[PDB]
Amino acid sequence: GWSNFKFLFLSPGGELYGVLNDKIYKGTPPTHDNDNWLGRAKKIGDGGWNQFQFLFFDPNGYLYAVSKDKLYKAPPPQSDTDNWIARATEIGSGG
Amino acid sequence: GWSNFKFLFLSPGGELYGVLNDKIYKGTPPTHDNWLGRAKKIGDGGWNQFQFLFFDPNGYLYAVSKDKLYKAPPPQSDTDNWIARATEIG
Amino acid sequence: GWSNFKFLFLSPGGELYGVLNDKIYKGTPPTHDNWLGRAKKIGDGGWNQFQFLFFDPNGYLYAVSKDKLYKAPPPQSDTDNWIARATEIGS
Amino acid sequence: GWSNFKFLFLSPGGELYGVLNDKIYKGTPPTHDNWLGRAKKIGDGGWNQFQFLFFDPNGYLYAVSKDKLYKAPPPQSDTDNWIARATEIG
Amino acid sequence: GWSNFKFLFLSPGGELYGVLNDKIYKGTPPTHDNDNWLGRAKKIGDGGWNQFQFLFFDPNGYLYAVSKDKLYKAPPPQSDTDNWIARATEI
Numbered sequence: 001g002w003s004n005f006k007f008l009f010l011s012p013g014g015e016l017y018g019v020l021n022d023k024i025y026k027g028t029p030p031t032h033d034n035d036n037w038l039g040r041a042k043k044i045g046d047g048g049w050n051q052f053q054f055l056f057f058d059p060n061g062y063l064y065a066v067s068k069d070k071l072y073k074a075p076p077p078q079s080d081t082d083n084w085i086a087r088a089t090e091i092g093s094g095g
Numbered sequence: 096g097w098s099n100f101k102f103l104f105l106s107p108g109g110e111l112y113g114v115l116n117d118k119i120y121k122g123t124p125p126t127h128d129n130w131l132g133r134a135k136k137i138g139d140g141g142w143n144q145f146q147f148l149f150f151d152p153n154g155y156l157y158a159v160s161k162d163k164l165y166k167a168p169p170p171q172s173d174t175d176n177w178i179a180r181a182t183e184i185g
Numbered sequence: 186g187w188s189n190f191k192f193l194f195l196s197p198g199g200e201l202y203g204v205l206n207d208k209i210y211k212g213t214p215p216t217h218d219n220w221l222g223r224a225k226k227i228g229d230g231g232w233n234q235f236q237f238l239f240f241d242p243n244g245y246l247y248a249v250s251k252d253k254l255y256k257a258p259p260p261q262s263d264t265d266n267w268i269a270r271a272t273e274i275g276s
Numbered sequence: 277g278w279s280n281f282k283f284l285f286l287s288p289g290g291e292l293y294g295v296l297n298d299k300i301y302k303g304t305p306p307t308h309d310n311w312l313g314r315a316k317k318i319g320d321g322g323w324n325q326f327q328f329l330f331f332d333p334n335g336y337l338y339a340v341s342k343d344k345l346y347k348a349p350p351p352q353s354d355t356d357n358w359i360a361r362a363t364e365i366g
Numbered sequence: 367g368w369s370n371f372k373f374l375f376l377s378p379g380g381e382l383y384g385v386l387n388d389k390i391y392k393g394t395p396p397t398h399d400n401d402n403w404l405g406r407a408k409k410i411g412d413g414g415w416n417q418f419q420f421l422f423f424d425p426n427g428y429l430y431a432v433s434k435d436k437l438y439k440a441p442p443p444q445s446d447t448d449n450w451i452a453r454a455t456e457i
């Protein structure tokens with residue numbers, strides 16, 4: 001169901017991140033063909049991830065994200081209940 | 096111009112890779128300079144089929160096509176049938 | 186609008202690349218209070234001499250001190266001595 | 277307010293910058309209106325310390341403070357000011 | 367000379383503007399050390415320019431003036447007989 005992901009990208013701590021149906025997941029990349037990645041991935045965000053147009057890491061752990069006019073930089077979401085967009089530092093336009 | 100690309104991303108060895116009109120190219124990033132003109136074509140078709148394309152820091156290339164995920168060292172040259180030999184990890 | 190770009194990504198070297206329409210741009214990633222500085226100190230000493238200090242549309246800097254007008258490109262670092270290479274115009 | 281501002285200038289991108297009691301605000305030039313009440317406050321504290329505060333054509337903000345000279349992106353840059361400080365390698 | 371001006375700034379087009387003693391003047395920037403800028407400068411206002419605390423251009427050549435809590439916008443004056451203050455928009 002990899003073609004159904006909106007984002008699929010990598011942290012510098014080796015975790016694979018993926019945005020699927022407005023949720024975001026993470027986990028080490030699969031190694032074999034029979035590995036079921038979704039089934040061992042941690043869900044670290046439950047709604048609102050599809051709004052984004054770019055979403056990537058720098059090598060220092062920071063997660064960049066573009067939502068329409070705006071660029072955010074912050075450490076990645078840590079759980080389900082971590083409202084990332086609410087605490088992410090806007091560095092984007094002149095907000 | 097640059098917008099005709101479907102993918103355009105950097106490898107950790109410092110090389111920019113660009114999917115254009117079904118072919119893939121690589122060459123060092125531009126700084127001032129016609130990139131596409133001095134760029135090595137390293138694939139000759141099949142490259143639009145991908146939804147994602149990305150390097151890990153070890154120099155492995157990741158690719159998603161038709162609900163399948165692939166991993167291997169990047170296409171070496173236009174004679175290299177990458178998708179035929181890349182490892183399905185889906 | 187950061188969305189206008191079709192491509193937005195980083196270099197191992199720490200630079201931000203953005204493709205916008207047909208062109209590509211290479212620049213410093215934007216940053217998170219304290220302007221102010223830091224950053225960035227472009228000259229040290231001699232600067233409150235001046236009554237006016239302003240730019241050419243071409244990026245040449247003008248300054249007025251003691252009834253004389255001075256012109257030169259701006260210093261790129263605080264080691265660069267400006268007035269010293271600034272030529273005076275107005276007789 | 278107008279006569280209470282220390283500084284009142286425009287960026288190469290057409291935004292009006294105002295420094296008032298140690299705070300700097302930006303926002304679209306008036307055309308009429310309550311410019312202050314509806315501006316974005318982009319800095320707080322020490323803004324009155326400068327003797328000069330002005331742009332270069334390329335969107336760098338210059339500042340004179342305590343006999344020294346300073347240069348940086350304005351506080352709270354936007355995308356257009358980024359593109360202008362950027363090297364176009366298109 | 368220069369230190370007697372209250373305002374001395376550049377239009378987006380490259381012309382130098384200066385307020386000297388309630389009067390305002392314009393002309394291409396001094397080209398050399400010998401050049402007497404005021405001598406050839408075109409007088410573009412003959413009264414009422416000491417009143418301003420700020421006097422500046424935007425990118426499109428509009429001129430702004432601040433005077434007792436009123437801001438004034440309009441294309442710049444062009445001569446002795448151009449009543450700028452009265453045709454300016456009174457923000």
Ligand SMILES: CC(=O)N[C@H]1C(=O)O[C@H](CO)[C@@H](O)[C@@H]1O
Binds near residue numbers: 044047079080081085
């Ligand atoms: C884009 C974003 O930050 N989404 C988060 C959010 O809005 O708060 C939720 C908790 O209420 C999280 O589950 C979501 O991950």
Ligand SMILES: CC(=O)N[C@H]1C(=O)O[C@H](CO)[C@@H](O)[C@@H]1O
Binds near residue numbers: 176
């Ligand atoms: C997606 C992919 O692997 N494309 C390759 C392919 O189809 O085989 C060709 C050589 O036979 C290469 O030129 C292509 O680059």
Ligand SMILES: CC(=O)N[C@H]1C(=O)O[C@H](CO)[C@@H](O)[C@@H]1O
Binds near residue numbers: 227228231232264265
């Ligand atoms: C007015 C002027 O140009 N002052 C410069 C100066 O005196 O030399 C120094 C470089 O050594 C610089 O720090 C100062 O900016």
Ligand SMILES: CC(=O)N[C@H]1C(=O)O[C@H](CO)[C@@H](O)[C@@H]1O
Binds near residue numbers: 443
């Ligand atoms: C501030 C201002 O606009 N002053 C003008 C004015 O009031 O009328 C005069 C001619 O009528 C001009 O010479 C002045 O420049």
